Design a protein around this ligand. Sequence first.
Ligand SMILES: Nc1nc(Nc2ccc(S(N)(=O)=O)cc2)nn1C(=O)c1c(F)cccc1F
Length: 290
Amino acid sequence: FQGDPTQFEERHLKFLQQLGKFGSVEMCRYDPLQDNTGEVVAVKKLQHSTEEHLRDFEREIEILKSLQHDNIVKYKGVCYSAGRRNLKLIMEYLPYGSLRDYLQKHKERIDHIKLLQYTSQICKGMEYLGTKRYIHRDLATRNILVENENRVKIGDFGLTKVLPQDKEYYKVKESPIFWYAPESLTESKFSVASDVWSFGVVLYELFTYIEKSKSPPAEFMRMIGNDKQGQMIVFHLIELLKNNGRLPRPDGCPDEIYMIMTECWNNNVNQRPSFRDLALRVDQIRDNMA
Ligand SMILES: Nc1nc(Nc2ccc(S(N)(=O)=O)cc2)nn1C(=O)c1c(F)cccc1F
């Protein structure tokens, strides 16, 4: 039993709202005291409850339970529903959903200052994750959640891997390709540096405000050619990335931010900056402003 089986009993986990999809997440209220209501929580469940999917779910639960950081979604427990013959993950509920939907829905309260604040908080969450030798493998604005105007948190650790003891990279043997590093596309090798590449893509997303056709997939398809389909796309992408093909500077994006993006988008793995470098640089850019 990963979590205390009495902490969240299914008879008191009341449904409130469906939140969407790597599995499926609901909004619930844990109401132990008759109808006193209580804590609002997010509940993740599986969509195709197979043995392999449930083992991956166990791995994700173990990853999330070991994390305690201001920019990481809080683990709260596990609910063993269906007479303790099923497994559901309990975490905190962030009211404003994904950072992508937040940038699309609430543009009235978002500016460059907020974008740099979110960038820094993501960097610090990733530093914390690297201290655990975890590789998130899926850094994207859709997987970063907004608690309020001033706080974002890294979530969706379904693809997260633990680095081997004597290896600085993890080789996956079983895909958001437009967020992948070239070595991830060509060798299935994932590391902190590939997470830094995906973070560069995340910064691009932030400074595009995710407008029409400005997304990394649409931009990469426009550069590759919308006439192509299938593995050929991937092929072109790899070739495109091998010879310095990059996403363009978003409109209104400062040249220093795009320089950070391009430094993250280095084909040389060891030349990409660390998350500590990136957090320090972003915070100094914020602090040096008037
Ligand atoms: N823990 C958590 N809280 C939320 N808040 C949320 C999400 C969506 C909306 S909505 N229907 O677009 O307006 C509103 C509030 N999500 N969340 C998750 O783990 C989560 C995730 F990581 C990815 C996808 C879905 C999730 F649910």
